[PDB]
Structure 1
Amino acid sequence: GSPTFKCAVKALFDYKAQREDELTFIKSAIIQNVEKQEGGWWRGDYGGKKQLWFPSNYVEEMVNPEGIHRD
């Protein structure tokens, strides 16, 4: 995918907000800067917006560790 810095994830399922303090990110989407909130709700950019919301029922801190560095 695209292993980078910051705490990212890899949406396991699909969403459909697109822009509502939540996004329509689809499965495989990789959000950056994350942190559950008020329970099981995560934040982090994913497009022209910056830190909206994604269920802790719809995401997961990349179930695949390991990661290489660029240049």
Structure 2
Amino acid sequence: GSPTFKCAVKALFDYKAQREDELTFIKSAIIQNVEKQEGGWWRGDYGGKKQLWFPSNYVEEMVNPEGIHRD
């Protein structure tokens, strides 16, 4: 996928906001700088946006450990 620094995730479910403070990110989307907020909602940039929202019912903080370093 896209293993990179920062705490990211890999949307397993599909959303449909596109830009409502939440995004229409689709399954496989990768968001960065994440952290569930009092309610079960996550933040983090995805696209030209920066820290919108994604369910803790839809996303999952990378259920695949491991990771390599570029150059």
Following the alignment from structure 1 to structure 2, what is the Cα–Cα distance between the partners of residues 39 and 7? 19
Equivalent pairs counted in the alignment come to: 71
Following the alignment from structure 2 to structure 1, what is the Cα–Cα distance between the partners of residues 53 and 37? 9
Following the alignment from structure 1 to structure 2, what is the Cα–Cα distance between the partners of residues 2 and 58? 18
Q: What do the CA deviations read for 1:32-51 (whole angstroms, capped 9, x no partner)?
A: 00000122000000011100
4+ aligned runs moved over 2 Å, structure 1:
none
Could you tell me which runs of 5 or more consecutive residues in structure 1 were left unpaired when the two chains were aligned. Answer: none
Q: Give, in angstroms, the shift of residue 5 of structure 1.
A: 0.3
Q: Give, in angstroms, the shift of residue 62 of structure 1.
A: 0.8
What are the residue-to-residue correspondences of 1:4-23 with 2, within 5 Å? 4-23=4-23
Q: Percent identity between the aligned chains?
A: 100
